[PDB]
Amino acid sequence: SEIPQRDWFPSDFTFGAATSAYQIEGAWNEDGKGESNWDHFCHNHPERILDGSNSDIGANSYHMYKTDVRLLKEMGMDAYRFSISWPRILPKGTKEGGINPDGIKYYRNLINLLLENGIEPYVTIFHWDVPQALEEKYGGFLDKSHKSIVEDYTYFAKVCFDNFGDKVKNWLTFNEPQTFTSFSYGTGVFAPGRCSPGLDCAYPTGNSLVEPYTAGHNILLAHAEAVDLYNKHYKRDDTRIGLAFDVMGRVPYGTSFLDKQAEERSWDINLGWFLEPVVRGDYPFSMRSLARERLPFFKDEQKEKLAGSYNMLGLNYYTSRFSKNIDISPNYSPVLNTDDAYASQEVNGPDGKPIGPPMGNPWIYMYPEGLKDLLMIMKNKYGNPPIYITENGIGDVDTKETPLPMEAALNDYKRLDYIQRHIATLKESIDLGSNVQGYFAWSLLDNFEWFAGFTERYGIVYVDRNNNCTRYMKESAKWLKEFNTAKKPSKK
Amino acid sequence: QMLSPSEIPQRDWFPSDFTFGAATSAYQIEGAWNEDGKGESNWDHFCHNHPERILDGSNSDIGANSYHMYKTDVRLLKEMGMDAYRFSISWPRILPKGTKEGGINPDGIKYYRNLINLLLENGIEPYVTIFHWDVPQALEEKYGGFLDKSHKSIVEDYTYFAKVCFDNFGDKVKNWLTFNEPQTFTSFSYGTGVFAPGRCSPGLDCAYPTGNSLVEPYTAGHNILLAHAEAVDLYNKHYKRDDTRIGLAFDVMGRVPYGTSFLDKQAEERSWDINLGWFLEPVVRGDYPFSMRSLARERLPFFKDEQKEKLAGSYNMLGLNYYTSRFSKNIDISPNYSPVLNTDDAYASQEVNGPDGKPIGPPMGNPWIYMYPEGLKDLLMIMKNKYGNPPIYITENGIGDVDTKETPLPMEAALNDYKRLDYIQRHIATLKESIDLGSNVQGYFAWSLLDNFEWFAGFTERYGIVYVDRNNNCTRYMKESAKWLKEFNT
């Protein structure tokens, strides 16, 4: 059968689940934790969240992590990817502000419990939760000096290396810098909600063509400094560090050679943006030729620290899009930073049919082939470095007007089928030379899905918010459980 | 060097309808530069006023004296069994003042009709290049020729010259090429300035460093495209017959990524674009390559919709002048780098020697030709897979034997041109390989039926398959290459 079996993959292969701090933790202002950009955004603009909710409680994992670890254990996961709340560790976001003991202890307890149970931690240092104190001091990642945020982020990473480096062997400095920059300062659907005048976001007094690039540049400088620090004082033979990129596969809209060029520019604007800098030390050629002065140059010293600043890389894959060419002409001018790719990303092809089957929410269309394309690109174009699919899954719609019955939410067969197909694609990719080494289902738990609030459940484990956030294994989780039971069965 | 007799191309390797011929250009072989009322050209002017810009300080006042010896040229073509002969028309020989009001020169019309008729008499099909770099000096002084900032005068004057050609030769000519190597013409004439009028950007070494190597080449190229579009429109609407065809020929050097980095693949891409796509894409889809627009920006003119419409599909066939290839190496956009020449807009260095230190192919003698037939195959695959697999003619292919005063080439050695024969045989063989791969190539023209004036190289290079003794009344002598071609076609 083509249904994935654990013996399809090497003994060393890794299978886990993933979450992020703001999305599952709760205890937003408990035990000294400082306010983050998201606490601020949700509390100030509930109307910018689909269901007007916030993650004050989320999945209450700050108090229920032991149940989280138990389920991970029961499912036989090899690893668990989670993030550290910058403001829970440093309430004022700086060294000056001081470290929060309860924050350090929370993560220390989680990490130790995971390891004791034989589950390897894959820690995301920054998963979009910027301490509000930094946002107010210098705009956080919008820091025009390119110094303040780099120093503050670097110290944050230092505190993580100092307090957890003896137990953590896998680090991810940043999660989806492209989504973060483009959504936060481009379309403004993410905190702080900035965008160009004329666009519909909470603060249409920004610049979608510039701020996303300013933020991205500071993120890359911060990543380079943190990795430099790591390699000089905390690096160990068995530890790895990198970052995770959000990536949607790209496929030519039509047959014209122009759509092939459009496709290339789209991989560039989405993946290339942050990938090429850590691979070779600079932005993709296409981006420098189109964004021009809006895309900052790197000093030679920065280019050096940037090139090769990873031991592994994560890819968060969910869907794909058809790329359609847009010619450079006097009748076209970019509005969003993503418009600099001179191509429109389409869900539907020229025949009026979606690239793949819709999975339920507004943007996820199933197209496993896209993942294979992505892996072949990493293999053939970017040196075939160690790759971990740090995120993959779907969100089941559940709203007040369209309630999702718990029994139906638990019988998540679409998610199961989707997960199985992507794991199968990983096997096909491996048989073609891909250096992929692990897979993480996104959302061990149903959680706060940013601007979607609680309208989408991505968990393999159901969280009953109506009843003390009690957890319930869904069919997907149960299949993963049997899948992980043994590396190599006997009889699959 | 020169291998296996079982590899030697045979005529039956190609379809009965395939076309094999030789090629020349007006200024290079005609001579009679000011005879029978012929007007002065940009090249007459350049060679006369700037002999130091020509390797041996020569000029083509006589060339191969084909204006008078064309009957012998036809004879040789006939003897070699050539199916066709590609030659060009001298704009100034037809229109001394390059304009309609300047009048048509009856002696010019006569000359070409005699050549064309004699060719057809001997069963040789004429392939006529309308413009082969010889602009009437009168137009150059009037508004700068293709530098016309109005983008109207030159288009009108060229369209009229084209009309005179269609009117007076269209009855016998069924194969037209509007322009020869537009990229070479624009870049060399206004970029590096090695070609007449010899303009370049201030601070650069050329006869007239008062131009702009980042704009003039594009202005000229833009006018050339508008001129081509107009001429083609005119042709289709008044001269096009079911059995006649029109197009143009592009100069093309193959491009191979320098190293294994994906960056060199992209550099190779931009290079094919700046060299070939610059003029190919406009005639294929009505606009310049995306890469060029993203890099040259406003230095690359926009087309009016009416023009994009006339440009798109303005050809029934396409010519490719192929001689060698280069390794393309990436150059990043940065505050430390600034383009100087229009060709620098491609952000890539063109290298002869690869990362292993070996030349892309064996040197053929002159300073730039390295034998790499595989590059021709790469080119035909691109044409087939990316640009609609249109009918293709290799309108130029060959090598130039160095023959200077310092190091004179013994005539006997000049005639035993085995290196050229080898090169010719290998590229023809490559056409057979490309055909088996789906290429829609329909013909091959060895460049230089005769040793001629090789532009800034003067007479230091002999590209002919037929030797021309300029010392003894420009007498012609068959070289080994010609003798093999004779056998090939028989």
Tell how far CA B221 is from the center of its chain.
14
User: Active-site residue A176, yes or no?
Assistant: yes
Which residue of chain B comes nearest to A260, CA vs CA?
B386
Residues of A with Cβ-Cβ distance to B387 under 8 angstroms: 257
How many C-alpha atoms does A416 have within 13 Å on its Cβ side?
18
Catalytic annotation, pick one of B40, B140, B181, B269: B181
- The answer to whether A173 and A240 have CB atoms below 8 angstroms apart is no
Pairing verdict, β B461-462 and B401-402? antiparallel
List residues bridging with B468 in a β-sheet. Answer: B476
Interface of A with B in 267-306 (CB under 8 A): 280, 282, 285-286, 288-290, 297
Tokens of A342: 């001179």
Q: Which candidate in A328, A329, A384 is best for mutational testing of the B interface (most B CBs within 10 A)? A: A328
Sign of CA dihedral B440, B445, B446, B452: negative
A240 reaches B (C-beta below 8 A): no
Cα separation values, B346 from A73, A226, A288, B290, Å:
56, 36, 13, 12
Residue B359 token pair:
């030349």
Q: Is B315 exposed, middle or buried (0-12, 13-18, 19+ CB in 10 A)?
A: buried
Q: Which of B266, B285, B302 sits opposite A285 (nearest CB)?
A: B266
Identify whether the C-beta of residue B89 lies closer than 8 Å to the C-beta of residue B112: yes
Distance between start and end Cα atoms, chain B = 25
Between CA B175 and CA B445 the distance in angstroms is 14
Beta bridge partners of A438: A14, A388
- Distance, in Å, from the CA atom of A153 to the CA atom of A225, rounded to the nearest integer, reads 9
| Spatial separation of the C-alpha atoms in residues A32 and B356, rounded to whole Å | 62
Distance CA A115, CA B425 (A): 71
Residue of B nearest to A282 (CA): B332
Nearest CA in chain A to B330: A285
Cα–Cα distance for residue pair B250/A149, rounded to 1 Å: 53
- Rounded to whole angstroms, the Cα distance separating A28 from B99 reads 83
Nearest to A261 among B262, B290, B335 (CB): B290
Question: Is there a contact between B294 and A328 if contact means CB atoms under 8 Å apart?
Answer: yes
CA B393 → CA A85, A384, A483, B250, B337, distances in Å?
67, 42, 61, 10, 38
Q: Which among B262, B293, B386 has CB closest to A381?
A: B262
CATH number for the region A1-492 comes to 3.20.20.80
Q: Which residue of B has its CA nearest to A327?
A: B290
Q: In terms of C-beta distances under 8 Å and separation of at least 24 residues, what long-range contacts does B9-16 make, across chains too?
A: B9/B425, B9/B428, B9/B429, B9/B432, B9/B488, B10/B488, B11/B488, B11/B489, B13/B432, B14/B431, B14/B432, B14/B435
Q: Across the interface, which of A285, A330, A381 has its CB nearest the CB of B333? A: A285
- The burial of B352, by beta-carbon neighbours within 10 Å (0-12 exposed, 13-18 middle, 19 or more buried), is given as middle
Closest CA to B416 of B465, B350, B459: B465
Closest CA relative to residue B176, chosen from B250, B86, B252, B280: B86
Sign of the Cα pseudo-torsion (A210, A212, A214, A217, in order): negative
Q: Which of residues 337-376 of A touch B (CB under 8 A)?
A: 342
What are the backbone angles phi and psi of residue A41, rounded to the nearest 5°? -60, -50
Write the single-letter amino acid at A199: L
How does strand B466-469 pair with strand B461-462? unpaired
| Strand-pair partners of A170 | A122, A240
The two three-digit tokens of residue A478, written as one number: 């149960």
Neighbours of B171 (CB within 10 A): 12
Q: Is A175 among the annotated ligand-binding positions?
A: yes
In terms of DSSP bridges, do strands B475-478 and A436-442 run parallel, antiparallel, or are they unpaired? unpaired
| Resolution for the entry shown, Å | 2.0
β-pairing verdict for A343-346 and A313-325: antiparallel
- Exposure pattern of B3-21 as b/e (b: 16+ CB <10 Å)? eeeeebbeeebbeeebbbb
Which entry of A176, A211, A264, A456 is annotated as an active-site residue?
A176
Query: Which residue in the block uniquely carries the two structure tokens 């998540």?
Result: A412
Residue A90 φ then ψ, to 5°: -130, 90
Catalytic residue among A35, A135, A225, A391: A391
Across the interface, do A282 and B332 touch by the CB < 8 Å criterion? yes
User: Does the annotation mark A304 as catalytic?
Assistant: no
Print the SS3 string covering chain B: CCCCCCCCCCHHHCCCCCEEEEECCHHHHCCCCCCCCCCCEHHHHHHHHCHHHCCCCCCCCCCCCHHHHHHHHHHHHHHCCCCEEEEECCHHHHCCCCCCCCCCCHHHHHHHHHHHHHHHHCCCEEEEEEECCCCEHHHHHHHCHHHCCCCCHHHHHHHHHHHHHHHHHCCCCCEEEEEECHHHHHHHHHCCCCCCCCECCCCCCCCECCCCCCCHHHHHHHHHHHHHHHHHHHHHCCCCCCCCEEEEEEEEEEEEECCCCHHHHHHHHHHHHHHHHHHHHHHHHCCCCHHHHHHHHHHCCCCCHHHHHHHCCCCCEEEEEEEEEEEEEECCCCCCCCCCCHHHHHCEEEECECCCCCECCCECCCCCCECCHHHHHHHHHHHHHCCCCCCEEEEECCCCEECCCCCCCCHHHHHCCHHHHHHHHHHHHHHHHHHCCCCCEEEEEEECCECCCCHHHCCCEECCCEEEECCCCCEEEECHHHHHHHHHHC
- Check the CA dihedral A275-A278-A283-A284 and report its sign: negative
Contacts of B88 (CB under 8 A, 6+ apart): B24, B25, B26, B128, B129, B130, B131, B132, B134, B180
Of B30, B269, B396, B461, the catalytic one is: B396
From chain A, pick out residues whose CB is under 8 angstroms from the CB of B307.
none
Start-to-end C-alpha separation, chain A: 9
Q: How many CB atoms lie within 10 A of CB A195?
A: 26
Residues A142 and A127: their CA atoms lie apart, in Å, by 16
Interruption sites in chain A after residues (C→N beyond 2.5 Å): 491
Question: Does the CB of A332 have a partner CB in chain B at under 8 Å?
Answer: no
Q: In angstroms, rounded to a whole number, what is the distance separating the alpha carbons of residues B462 and B470?
A: 12
Residue environment code for A91-113, b if the CB has 16+ CB neighbours within 10 A, otherwise e: bbbbeebeebeebbebbeebbeb
Rounded Cα distance between A190 and A177, Å, is 13
Confirm or reject contact between B99 and chain A (CB < 8 A): no
Residue in the structure block whose two tokens are 């005769």: B450
> Pseudo-torsion of CA A154, A155, A158, A162, nearest 10°?
-170
Radius of gyration of chain A (CA): 21
- Across the interface, of B263, B293, B387, the residue whose CB is closest to A328 is B293
Are A393 and A446 in contact by the 8 Å Cβ rule? The answer is: no
CATH tag for B1-490 (out of 1.10.150.170, 3.20.20.80, 3.40.50.150, 3.40.1440.60): 3.20.20.80
Distances (CA, A) of A151 to A97, A135, A145, A262: 14, 14, 11, 37
User: In A451-480, which positions are buried (b, 16+ CB within 10 angstroms) versus exposed (e)?
Assistant: bbbbbbbbbbbbbeeeeebebebbebbebb
B449 phi-psi bin (left φ>0, alpha ψ -120 to 50, beta other):
alpha
Rounded to 10°, the helix B418-435/B373-385 angle is 30
Question: If you measure CA to CA, which chain A residue comes closest to B348?
Answer: A285
Residue A426 sits at the vertex; the CA angle it makes with A77 and A125, to the nearest 5 degrees, is 55
Method of determination? X-ray
Token pair 């160095």 in the structure block, residue: B402
Cβ atoms A99, A159 nearer than 8 A: yes
> Distance between CA atoms of A120 and A374, rounded to whole angstroms?
26
Q: Where are the domains of chain A?
A: 1-492
Nearest 5°: phi and psi at A88? -80, -30
Alpha-carbon distance A40 to A140, whole Å?
A: 13
Q: Enter the tokens of residue B88.
A: 């060009």
Task: Answer whether A435 touches B (CB < 8 Å).
Answer: no
Q: Which residues contact A120 (CB under 8 A, 6 or more apart)?
A: A14, A16, A78, A79, A80, A114, A169, A170
The pairing of strands A343-346 and A240-252 is unpaired
| A458 marked as binding residue | yes
Residues 6+ apart with CB under 8 A from B407: none
Residue among B246, B303, B306, B250 at smallest CA distance from B273? B250
Q: How far is CA B247 from CA B236, B309, B468, in A?
A: 11, 16, 30
Q: How far apart are CA B295 and CA B273, in angstroms?
A: 12
Kind of pairing between the strands at B84-88 and B19-23: parallel
Nearest CA to B251 out of B345, B157, B129 is that of: B129
Pairing label, strands A470-473, A461-464: antiparallel
Q: How far is B206 from chain A (nearest CA, A)?
A: 30
Q: Is A370 exposed, middle or buried (0-12, 13-18, 19+ CB in 10 A)?
A: buried
> What residues in A contact B295, CB-CB < 8 Å?
289
Q: Which of B19, B18, B43 is nearest to B30 (CA)?
A: B43
3-state secondary structure chain A: CCCCCHHHCCCCCEEEEECCHHHHCCCCCCCCCCCEHHHHHHHHCHHHCCCCCCCCCCCCHHHHHHHHHHHHHHCCCCEEEEECCHHHHCCCCCCCCCCCHHHHHHHHHHHHHHHHCCCEEEEEEECCCCEHHHHHHHCHHHCCCCCHHHHHHHHHHHHHHHHHCCCCCEEEEEECHHHHHHHHHCCCCCCCCECCCCCCCCECCCCCCCHHHHHHHHHHHHHHHHHHHHHHHCCCCCCEEEEEEEEEEEEECCCCHHHHHHHHHHHHHHHHHHHHHHHHCCCCHHHHHHHHHHCCCCCHHHHHHHCCCCCCEEEEEEEEEEEEECCCCCCCCCCCHHHHHCEEEECECCCCCECCCECCCCCCECCHHHHHHHHHHHHHCCCCCCEEEEECCCCEECCCCCCCCHHHHHCCHHHHHHHHHHHHHHHHHHCCCCCEEEEEEECCECCCCHHHCCCEECCCEEEECCCCCEEEECHHHHHHHHHHCCCCCCCC
Q: By the CB < 8 Å criterion, does A9 face chain B?
A: no
H, E, C per residue of B215-235: CHHHHHHHHHHHHHHHHHHHH
Residue A139 buriedness (CB in 10 A; 0-12 / 13-18 / 19+)? buried
Cβ pair A328:B295 closer than 8 A:
no
Instruction: Please judge whether B263 and A280 are an interchain contact, meaning their C-beta atoms are less than 8 angstroms apart.
Output: yes
